[PDB]
Design a protein around this ligand. Structure first.
Ligand SMILES: [Au+]
Ligand SMILES: [Cl-]
Ligand SMILES: [Cl-]
Ligand SMILES: [Cl-]
Ligand code: NA
Length: 129
């Protein structure tokens, strides 16, 4: 599923991501945008063999289990395939855990290089929230 910009914002808020750990909704969306371009089915392989899944490109090294990432963890306790679902609940609960891990949203390289310090608010401009 490819979400609409305003559509994902709504979903993200309903699931309490809006301002979770102090990160405004617009930050979360800017992330989704650059991590997956709003497509719940996005997968991207990393050189180290781990794999990024979902709207937030959650990694198999620590957060989910794909059964193919030698010596990794599954800290969110979920098959990485739950992160490719049309319902974003799982991605959202795993992100809450990820973002609370000490480094905040830097955990998402794309957010740091493309969202951090930008007018993230633009991402929700217009949305009926
Ligand atoms: Au949802
Ligand atoms: Cl594994
Ligand atoms: Cl949803
Ligand atoms: Cl922080
Ligand atoms: Na795993």
């Amino acid at each position: 599923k490819v979400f609409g910009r305003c559509e994902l914002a709504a979903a993200m808020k309903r699931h309490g991501l809006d301002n979770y750990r102090g990160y405004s909704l617009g930050n979360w969306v800017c992330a989704a945008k650059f991590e997956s371009n709003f497509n719940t089915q996005a997968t991207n392989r990393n050189t180290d063999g781990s794999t990024d899944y979902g709207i937030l490109q959650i990694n198999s090294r620590w957060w989910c289990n794909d059964g193919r990432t030698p010596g990794s963890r599954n800290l969110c306790n979920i098959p990485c395939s739950a992160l490719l679902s049309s319902d974003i609940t799982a991605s959202v609960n795993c992100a809450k855990k990820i973002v609370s891990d000490g480094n905040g949203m830097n955990a998402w390289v794309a957010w740091r290089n493309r969202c951090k310090g930008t007018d993230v608010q633009a991402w929700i401009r217009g949305c009926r929230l």
